[PDB]
Amino acid sequence: EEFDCHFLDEGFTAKDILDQKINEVSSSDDKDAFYVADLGDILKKHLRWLKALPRVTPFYAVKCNDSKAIVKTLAATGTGFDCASKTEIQLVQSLGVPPERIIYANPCKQVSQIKYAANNGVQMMTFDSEVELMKVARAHPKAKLVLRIATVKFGATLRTSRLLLERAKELNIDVVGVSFHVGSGCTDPETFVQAISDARCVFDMGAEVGFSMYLLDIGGGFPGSEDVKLKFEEITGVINPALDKYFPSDSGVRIIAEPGRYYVASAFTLAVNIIAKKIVLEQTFMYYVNDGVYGSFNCILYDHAHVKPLLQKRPKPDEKYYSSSIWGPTCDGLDRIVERCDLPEMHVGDWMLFENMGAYTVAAASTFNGFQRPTIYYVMSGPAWQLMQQFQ
Amino acid sequence: EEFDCHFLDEGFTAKDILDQKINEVSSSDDKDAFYVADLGDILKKHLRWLKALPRVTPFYAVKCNDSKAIVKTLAATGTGFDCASKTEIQLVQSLGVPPERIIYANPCKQVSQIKYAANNGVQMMTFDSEVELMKVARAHPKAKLVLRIATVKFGATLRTSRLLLERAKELNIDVVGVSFHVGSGCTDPETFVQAISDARCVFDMGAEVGFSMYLLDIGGGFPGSEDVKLKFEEITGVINPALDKYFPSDSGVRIIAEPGRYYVASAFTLAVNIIAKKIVLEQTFMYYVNDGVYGSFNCILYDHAHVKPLLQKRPKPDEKYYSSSIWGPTCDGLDRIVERCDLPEMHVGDWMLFENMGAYTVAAASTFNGFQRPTIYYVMSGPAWQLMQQFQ
């Protein structure tokens, strides 16, 4: 290891360790925000993934949570990986994942990075512009391209798709298939069905001009926590049919997905410390915690997260709540975590909990104002590690 | 040095080095975005600050551009520094800046960082909440407090200020003075006058209860480029009066300010490379460059910047422009730099320039999606270095 990985004893859960670690610090000082990353919770998710989409190989979107522990755990399990930069590819390879288990999914790759990928055995890439294709002919002509269709920054339409395939023929580049991305703000499950239906169409378009296409990549956008309206399995209910319909297994197709938030969202809890307080007329409170929209909560901007503040201190049986807002630690007037919420009067020194903080949080945090990335404590149960061995 | 500092030869300017460096990398590519930081431009600014506000000592807001070369250059000049975290204080001190030249301006400090500041000789801090005071009593009782007033996350109103001074008396904490912060979205110069007027009032309020206050801190929010409507000196036109009126120098007051964007905004140009391109019906273009809203351009979100794309390639004498948008390099659909603009048809390999990119750009950049922080080339002219000596 080059990471703080600890084994949970018999009856201990992740949240118990969190509860423990905040307690075993209350002497002295230094009540810096920290994560508890339950690697078990990631296994659970992989396993559950195998159950739900048993046709669909998952290729973890590294971008989502780039942490070495997450990728090493996942690697051990036998997931594929979705990399979008040379540096993502290097990470994965430096954990001994072979290239066959990587898809360079970024549709607009800087040429030197295409070059990097080519000098390292990464054959499968994604595209959706004619220019992209010209790049690939120059930099990686043996590459296996996946055409990325629309469902906006990325996604070729069907008219372009026809023109791309032709332009890819005159170029002698192999198009092994089609990829779409639904997006996390996915309300309708129908969207999947529609997109699979369009992909089946491009597969047909593609055979018409002699492409022997064998790959369907269904993107990501699967939820990572139970605390959403449209649940994971509900989505897989309308996919398996649509897949069996347009992509029956006797057609020798191979189906993959790019899940990110799905694996890691719930796996991480964030304990931040109330470090200052203001009373406004004792009617409403403003609390200042030591992580902001420039740190872990950057997601309330970039990823459109809604965060729910949880009390680490088990609440009293009826206690009088007040209108409270939570703020980040920076000199930025706009660094505000919760605009309005309902809370017991709390105190400087009290810790707040933030559940489901794995996805698109630490990965896009910057140390603006000089504030440090919170320290991450990896934990894994006895059972969990057994299960990670079976996958080896 | 631990930074790439180069001396411009006779007729070379910063922009000439940029023009030079992009030309010296046209063969075997690797066209990564890079900054050209003219440290001479920084000097110019300090010199011009001395002329404009000759009463006011400038305390650079480290937060804004924490680069080691920027700090060291400024330190060498004799500016003070505005730190908001332990880590900002450390940086400054690690460059030999004595603590008398530091103001811990963050009004809501985490107790351990107060403690750090206290064990390191940093006596001047800022506050605006009764809880803040309680903290200071416990952690740094000898501290010199600056009360930060309102002009919202920070700023005690005049009612609060009366109550704070009282509560600071019963606590035996010294309040040496007042600070306000106008903000960069400052349209009216009047706001300064108003705020100085309020600060004069708090000085009076404070003497009423026997505070011997000697410090006025006027914040920052001064513009860093000529390319704004309300210009630097114009603002100093309405300040020098206001100051001489409410804070005449025979009153032995000491006046400081916390400029950030003022010193550095214009000093940095960013060269990004167009790495992909799409054509939509050849009518409108989408260009993809290799820096985004997760990197340098994070400011278009956090700092509310509007960026003007410049052609590195001197334009043809009439050339046909098209509606173009510029995008960052991440898989984030929302990663968009310019939503719409007017540009010659340009190519994968062409570089675009972004002027005035010093402030609140690199300092809040994260390496999301695995994309690297652009490399920074520091440069300083013969003249410039001469002038940095005089200040020593």
Swiss-Prot record, chains A, B:
<protein>
    <recommendedName>
        <fullName>Ornithine decarboxylase</fullName>
        <ecNumber>4.1.1.17</ecNumber>
    </recommendedName>
</protein>
<dbReference type="GO" id="GO:0008284">
    <property type="term" value="P:positive regulation of cell population proliferation"/>
</dbReference>
<dbReference type="GO" id="GO:0008283">
    <property type="term" value="P:cell population proliferation"/>
</dbReference>
<dbReference type="GO" id="GO:0006595">
    <property type="term" value="P:polyamine metabolic process"/>
</dbReference>
<feature type="site" description="Stacks against the aromatic ring of pyridoxal phosphate and stabilizes reaction intermediates">
    <location>
        <position position="181"/>
    </location>
</feature>
<keyword id="KW-1063">Hypotrichosis</keyword>
<keyword id="KW-0210">Decarboxylase</keyword>
<dbReference type="InterPro" id="IPR000183">
    <property type="entry name" value="Orn/DAP/Arg_de-COase"/>
</dbReference>
<feature type="modified residue" description="S-nitrosocysteine; in inhibited form">
    <location>
        <position position="331"/>
    </location>
</feature>
<keyword id="KW-0456">Lyase</keyword>
<dbReference type="GO" id="GO:0005829">
    <property type="term" value="C:cytosol"/>
</dbReference>
<dbReference type="GO" id="GO:0042176">
    <property type="term" value="P:regulation of protein catabolic process"/>
</dbReference>
<comment type="subunit">
    <text>Homodimer. Only the dimer is catalytically active, as the active sites are constructed of residues from both monomers. Does not form a heterodimer with AZIN2.</text>
</comment>
<feature type="binding site">
    <location>
        <position position="184"/>
    </location>
    <ligand>
        <name>pyridoxal 5'-phosphate</name>
    </ligand>
</feature>
<keyword id="KW-0225">Disease variant</keyword>
<dbReference type="InterPro" id="IPR022657">
    <property type="entry name" value="De-COase2_CS"/>
</dbReference>
<keyword id="KW-0597">Phosphoprotein</keyword>
<feature type="binding site">
    <location>
        <position position="221"/>
    </location>
    <ligand>
        <name>pyridoxal 5'-phosphate</name>
    </ligand>
</feature>
<feature type="binding site" description="in other chain">
    <location>
        <begin position="302"/>
        <end position="303"/>
    </location>
    <ligand>
        <name>substrate</name>
    </ligand>
</feature>
<dbReference type="InterPro" id="IPR022644">
    <property type="entry name" value="De-COase2_N"/>
</dbReference>
<keyword id="KW-0620">Polyamine biosynthesis</keyword>
<feature type="active site" description="Proton donor; shared with dimeric partner">
    <location>
        <position position="331"/>
    </location>
</feature>
<dbReference type="GO" id="GO:0005737">
    <property type="term" value="C:cytoplasm"/>
</dbReference>
<comment type="function">
    <text>Catalyzes the first and rate-limiting step of polyamine biosynthesis that converts ornithine into putrescine, which is the precursor for the polyamines, spermidine and spermine. Polyamines are essential for cell proliferation and are implicated in cellular processes, ranging from DNA replication to apoptosis.</text>
</comment>
<comment type="pathway">
    <text>Amine and polyamine biosynthesis; putrescine biosynthesis via L-ornithine pathway; putrescine from L-ornithine: step 1/1.</text>
</comment>
<dbReference type="GO" id="GO:0042803">
    <property type="term" value="F:protein homodimerization activity"/>
</dbReference>
<feature type="modified residue" description="N6-(pyridoxal phosphate)lysine">
    <location>
        <position position="63"/>
    </location>
</feature>
<feature type="binding site">
    <location>
        <position position="332"/>
    </location>
    <ligand>
        <name>substrate</name>
    </ligand>
</feature>
<comment type="similarity">
    <text>Belongs to the Orn/Lys/Arg decarboxylase class-II family.</text>
</comment>
<dbReference type="InterPro" id="IPR029066">
    <property type="entry name" value="PLP-binding_barrel"/>
</dbReference>
<keyword id="KW-0702">S-nitrosylation</keyword>
<feature type="binding site">
    <location>
        <begin position="258"/>
        <end position="261"/>
    </location>
    <ligand>
        <name>pyridoxal 5'-phosphate</name>
    </ligand>
</feature>
<dbReference type="GO" id="GO:0004586">
    <property type="term" value="F:ornithine decarboxylase activity"/>
</dbReference>
<dbReference type="InterPro" id="IPR022653">
    <property type="entry name" value="De-COase2_pyr-phos_BS"/>
</dbReference>
<dbReference type="InterPro" id="IPR022643">
    <property type="entry name" value="De-COase2_C"/>
</dbReference>
<dbReference type="InterPro" id="IPR002433">
    <property type="entry name" value="Orn_de-COase"/>
</dbReference>
<feature type="binding site">
    <location>
        <position position="360"/>
    </location>
    <ligand>
        <name>pyridoxal 5'-phosphate</name>
    </ligand>
</feature>
<dbReference type="Pfam" id="PF00278">
    <property type="entry name" value="Orn_DAP_Arg_deC"/>
</dbReference>
<keyword id="KW-0663">Pyridoxal phosphate</keyword>
<dbReference type="Pfam" id="PF02784">
    <property type="entry name" value="Orn_Arg_deC_N"/>
</dbReference>
<dbReference type="GO" id="GO:0009615">
    <property type="term" value="P:response to virus"/>
</dbReference>
<dbReference type="InterPro" id="IPR009006">
    <property type="entry name" value="Ala_racemase/Decarboxylase_C"/>
</dbReference>
